[PDB]
Amino acid sequence: TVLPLYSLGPSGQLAETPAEVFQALEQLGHQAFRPGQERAVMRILSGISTLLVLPTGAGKSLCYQLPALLYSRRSPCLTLVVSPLLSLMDDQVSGLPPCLKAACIHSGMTRKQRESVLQKIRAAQVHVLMLTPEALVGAGGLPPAAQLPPVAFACIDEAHCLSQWSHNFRPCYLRVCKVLRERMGVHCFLGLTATATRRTASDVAQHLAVAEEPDAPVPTNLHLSVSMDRDTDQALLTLLQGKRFQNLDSIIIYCNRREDTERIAALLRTCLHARAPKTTAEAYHAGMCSRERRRVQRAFMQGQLRVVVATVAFGMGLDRPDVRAVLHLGLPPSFESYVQAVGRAGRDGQPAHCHLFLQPQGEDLRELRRHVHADSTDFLAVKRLVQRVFPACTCTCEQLSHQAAPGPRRVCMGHERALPIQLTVQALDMPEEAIETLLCYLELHPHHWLELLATTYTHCRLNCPGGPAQLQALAHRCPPLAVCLAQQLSVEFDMVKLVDSMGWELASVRRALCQLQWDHEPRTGVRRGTGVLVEFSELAFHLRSPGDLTAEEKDQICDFLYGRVQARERQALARLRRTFQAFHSVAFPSCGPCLEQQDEERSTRLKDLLGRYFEEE
Ligand SMILES: [Zn+2]
């Protein structure tokens, strides 16, 4: 357990910022605190959770780097930074003193990667660990907090994903905070987000147990325009050659599909072929390997590449000052996504120009709507999922393998079940993220009892060289194997069925089964290998739910979950309509009128619309 670095003064007020923090701040490279950074850093150094909403992505890294540096100087500890896979996909390396490491899904070394990082942690050669959310609550997960150094605090990047009001709600973020509190000892969180309304930011503060406090107006030097050209490719060439854009040398163009980035980049390179030396345009999307993305971003940072054509999803994790223009080929899916992308231009006070090309026949809004309706879960899927999660048990009425008679009725104390992910996805026609979402909906509800224990392998297969006689000979070493061989009038079975029927823990069953690779020589001990093969498979949700629900109670559960599915859909549709209405209300038929100078009345009117959207509760 890590004690707070700084202690509160009398009456509970924050202690005055010491000299040490400033020294550390200079050491990292930044020579000044951005607004709200000094207070937030002092909060974490005192053990107080805090939410920080930043207008631009710049300065987000310093908020966890300075406390991690100071927490690690006092006593060997570890700071967890949770951020999406895109953030760690390309081996990002920060300041050297921290000695950071990343464990993510993309790491294709399996336990070797995680253990090498674990072994590096054990050698104190790691003080900041960056985990994608899926790695923290996935199959591999993290070792117990006892094996790990004590955690000073956890930084939650993209904290808006916790709230059902944000543009990008991800239920696994609810699981992350739960595991960090229960499995780990983390009760001091730093929430970092760059895009959130007052309704979303206040909801995140509820989840992180942060006191509410005011903490993104679009800058005055950004000049916005919107048009509905007939041919977007032709219009893009016409706009970039106009006087408003022809002398801007740092442009980002956001596209919907990544096949489009390579086409637009190749188009600009051929139609603008000509001080004199520098590269015109390069595509930047997630399909490219890690090397080519690093080079493209490096070239853009060094002013050697004029245009980067990227997808909205990959976007630009890089922050560069004096970015001159941001263009959108297609309606953005939300105000948050637009302001984030546009907020990258004009970091210096110098003027920056942004133009959005709406699809003339409205096909971009129709595609976004088609996606929302496709992500909706059918009611039959919700009904079939509830039946699989709350199946009837024999506690209140043979059916049980080890009962010859029903026996006296009992009050159901819950059962542990394995919901196989791949099997349920193909049987119910719903993706894994939707199943996870509905399970998270049920756990949060107070009246409905469900526990999402873990995501792990629950199926076990045992192949024997000696056939059936060799497997029977090992029944004295493994009580789980003993009850299986009796039930059977290569063997595989469900390990969570064993858990519930014999009262064991899933780990205890897993240990005893893999102990089947050792045998004791009759003379002495000299444990030697049995040669049996033990393989775990069928990744599943490990649940704990009652088995005594009536049909009426299951129906009420379905109405709850389906109501949440429809309300999430009505919210996503309402966000699309409100987003299109704003850009259209300010749009021209072509980019001709804004080839020379933007319309200040129109640019100001749009910037005021966005401002009132985020200042709303
Ligand atoms: Zn029961």
Numbering used by the authors: 449 to 663, 668 to 726, 735 to 857, 883 to 974, 984 to 1111
Could you give the paper's own sentences about this structure?
RecQ proteins are ATP- and DNA-dependent super family 2 (SF2) helicases and separate double stranded DNA (dsDNA) in a 3′ to 5′ direction. Remarkably, RecQ4 entirely lacks the RQC domain, yet its helicase activity is required for various DNA protective functions. Here we present the crystal structure of the human RecQ4 helicase, encompassing its central ATPase domain and a large fraction of its unique C-terminus. Downstream of the ATPase core, we identify a novel domain, which features homology to WH domains of various prokaryotic DNA-binding proteins and coordinates a Zn2+-ion, yet lacks structural resemblance to the conserved RQC domain.
The RecQ4427-1116 model was refined to a resolution of 2.75 Å and contains aa 449–1111. Two disordered regions within the C-terminus (aa 858–882 and aa 975–983) and two short areas within the ATPase domain (aa 664–667 and aa 727–734) are not resolved. Two ‘bridging’ α-helices (aa 823–835 and aa 1046–1079) link HD2 to a unique domain further downstream (aa 836–1045), which is not present in other RecQ helicases. Zn2+-coordination is accomplished via three cysteines and a histidine, which are located in the loop region between helix α12 and β-strand β13. The two bridging helices thus connect the HD2 to the R4ZBD in a hinge-like fashion, with the joint of the hinge being located at the HD2–bridge–helix interface. The R4ZBD, on the other side of this lever, interacts with HD1 through several salt bridges and hydrogen bonds. The R4ZBD of RecQ4 is located directly adjacent to HD1 and thus assumes a unique position among the characterized RecQ proteins, as their C-terminal extensions are located on the opposite side, directly adjacent to HD2. Our structural alignment between RecQ4 and other known RecQ structures revealed that RecQ4s bridging helix α11, the downstream part of bridging helix α19 and helix α20, together, mimic the conserved structure and exact position of the RQC-Zn2+-binding domain of other RecQ helicases, with the notable difference that RecQ4 does not coordinate a zinc ion at this position. In agreement with our ARL data, the RecQ4 structure exhibits a highly electropositive cleft between the R4ZBD and HD1, poised to bind the negatively charged ssDNA backbone. Our in vitro biochemical analysis of the RecQ4427–1116 variant provides evidence that our model features all necessary structural elements for ATP- and DNA-dependent helicase activity.
